[PDB]
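Q: Predict the assembly, please.
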Amino acid sequence: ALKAPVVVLGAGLASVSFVAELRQAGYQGLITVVGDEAERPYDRPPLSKDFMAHGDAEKIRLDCKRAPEVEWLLGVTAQSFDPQAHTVALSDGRTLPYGTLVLATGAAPRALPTLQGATMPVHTLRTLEDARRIQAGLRPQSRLLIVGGGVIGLELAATARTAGVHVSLVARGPRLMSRAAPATLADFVARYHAAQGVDLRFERSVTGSVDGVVLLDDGTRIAADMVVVGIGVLANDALARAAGLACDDGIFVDAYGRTTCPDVYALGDVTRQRNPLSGRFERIETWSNAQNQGIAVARHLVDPTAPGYAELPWYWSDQGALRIQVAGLASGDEEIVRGEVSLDAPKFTLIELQKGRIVGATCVNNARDFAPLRRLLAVGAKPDRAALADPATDLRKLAAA
Amino acid sequence: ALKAPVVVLGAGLASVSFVAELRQAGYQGLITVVGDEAERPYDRPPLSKDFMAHGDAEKIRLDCKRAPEVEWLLGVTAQSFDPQAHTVALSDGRTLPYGTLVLATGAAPRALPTLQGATMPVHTLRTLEDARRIQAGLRPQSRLLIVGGGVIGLELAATARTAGVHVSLVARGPRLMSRAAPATLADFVARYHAAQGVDLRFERSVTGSVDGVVLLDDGTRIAADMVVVGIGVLANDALARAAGLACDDGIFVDAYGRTTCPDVYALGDVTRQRNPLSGRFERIETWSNAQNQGIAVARHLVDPTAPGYAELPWYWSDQGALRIQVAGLASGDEEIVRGEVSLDAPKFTLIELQKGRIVGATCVNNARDFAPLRRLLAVGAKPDRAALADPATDLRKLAAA
Ligand SMILES: Cc1cc2nc3c(=O)[nH]c(=O)nc-3n(C[C@H](O)[C@H](O)[C@H](O)COP(=O)(O)OP(=O)(O)OC[C@H]3O[C@@H](n4cnc5c(N)ncnc54)[C@H](O)[C@@H]3O)c2cc1C
Ligand SMILES: Cc1cc2nc3c(=O)[nH]c(=O)nc-3n(C[C@H](O)[C@H](O)[C@H](O)COP(=O)(O)OP(=O)(O)OC[C@H]3O[C@@H](n4cnc5c(N)ncnc54)[C@H](O)[C@@H]3O)c2cc1C
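A: Predicted assembly structure:
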């Protein structure tokens, strides 16, 4: 079952979390991790946040201390694996044997086809190298165009505005954060960014570019010194596809992290997995999934009596003055708004319900509300909805009860 | 790998095809098939076609002759399996051991929630029992309402009209055959059915029913003596879900038929699998998939050097005077029409292309064109598009070349 030696492909958060849990759970056999980036393993959320603003990579490294006795092959690419021979072929000419192989290769930013032949700077923001490259170009009074309405681009937008950079943003949909964000939140977030000077263009797509100017599908133009594309990511599932595993922009796994190939597991951004709230398979793209799924899969490998991965989804985003936290589903049949939604000292909570049952929650500048709401969400609580609205109500009391 | 004994859950076409191929390929160990219907294994396409019209079940049985030495447990339901203990629990109190378990449990018609409390006859059409029940009610001059725009309902519509039954049809979309049928075909098919007296209602949904009358979302009513619901099917994946396999309205499998649980495979209508033309996972709902996927998975189990399942999708439908055949994708960036599209002696061929490459084809009353088109499709031929249109052109010559 858990057969030594263990080989993990990828050295991001999912991998680090997985190998630390293997050790903590008591597995003492060989663990080897192959990571294509020549970087001490590091966390990505700071890259569009404090790192983009302050530049110290030694504040963003992951703690591999809870993972003793691991050989990390950094700067090495796994090129293929042979699931019959139980081997992995590496870019440096070496081959690793495995008893258990774990694919934790993450995802990469989607390229924008219309900007393929561009003769102006066009970047994406995924790696430390990407962040350093973008940061090197955030000159005060320069012009940045962000393509896409997702959180990472909005975090970059806020960071750029704080740095004195002019920011325009083009999104193909009618709202920001179309993925897993309640409309009420998305609308407020647009109002916030507009108030901070972001030039927002909804329902537009990029059709191309000429001599430093980006073209839009309404026949207009946006001049910029740099474009940062953030229209989503694609799973890094090429090795899985070539080896015959079931994949579709993501490696399909069950709650034990098993792929369709025996002795091969997958974790984190590279996986397509069940969302227990929707009951549908989705590629979850969050820090909490990478950590939590890695831990759960490791725990169950060492102790097969342990339950499978069962945590419900959530994420956060830091956009200037907005500390955003979102859990569960973006919508149900009812939204309750706790507090006022205002640009004057923003602070509010949203609760999404389905037939009286909490299926999601949002907190903006209210971390204290978020933890008990996630607990109510996890048990599918059906609380009094006037109480949920009632600003008197203490949610922590509710959660403990 | 292929470990004896073999147990298959489900005794439909996928199962029969799979076990016959195991025997033909040379596997000589135990094979036991569990089938919940107390019926000699039978094919479903006749149920909305000649069986509905003539009623002889002994014309629709599957040939199990190429599957010698198989014990068929008919009228028995598999209630669960334990993938650790390698056992299956049966409804008759017995337990089967397995070395290799194969889930071939098909799919069941979706119920229409708005008709749940109906006090008039409401049926679906999947089984021999269903067909006999519906047929018993096809009284000449009675009124039948079909809900859904799919092929099975249209086949029933044609059969009913031939039997002197008045037929109305409600579809929520703007066209018939919204799934895997080119719009050109769907439009023609509607014209055909309307000409044969079917009362077609597009862009309407059923909101309920009262005392023998069905209610629609445009505020109107349709009286009927019988409703047959055909709004699609849902995979019978409950045993897989309970046992911890990756599922989402269908059991995920790779091209070897492997699920995420070692020693457990799945075939046919119950699977969600890669469509090589789209490169996306889909639940394929066709006779040819059930047969071909069953054969390919069996072949590779006996001979691991054999390739995985690789056949491209296709189906046919018999609707009165229309013998419809459809292969590949419904659309690309180009459609070529061979022949005239006319209700006067219907006979035409459609070819769908993507950047010059054939990605799909349709034949109406032209079986001779269909076989070479499927061959051109399989190799992704890029033929001369004037030649493809040119009625002189012989496609069989093209295919052999
Ligand atoms: C800028 C940014 C900001 C973010 N902010 C937040 C946030 O505030 N909150 C939040 O919830 N989430 C956030 N995320 C998301 C989060 O960081 C991801 O969910 C997480 O990184 C996924 O971890 P992972 O280990 O699965 O994948 P990854 O971090 O992508 O790690 C995979 C590693 O494997 C490597 N690899 C791929 N193929 C091979 C190969 N063949 N051989 C060797 N190595 C290979 C990759 O290059 C990569 O280094 C952010 C992400 C980014 C990029
Ligand atoms: C009326 C009709 C007309 C059709 N016409 C066409 C056509 O013209 N062309 C075409 O391409 N396709 C057609 N099809 C589709 C085609 O028949 C299916 O794709 C095919 O039946 C799928 O085969 P299967 O073996 O995967 O599933 P099934 O035929 O559904 O067989 C599965 C069997 O497993 C049983 N089962 C489920 N759960 C259990 C359990 N726990 N224990 C034991 N047994 C269980 C089921 O009850 C069923 O008997 C038609 C289908 C129908 C219903």
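DSSP finds ten helices and 26 strands in chain A. The pocket of flavin-adenine dinucleotide (ligand 2) is lined by residues B 9-15, 34-37, 44-45, 47-48, 77-78, 104-107, 125-126, 152, 236, 239, 268-270, 285-288, 290, 315-317 (CB under 6 Å).
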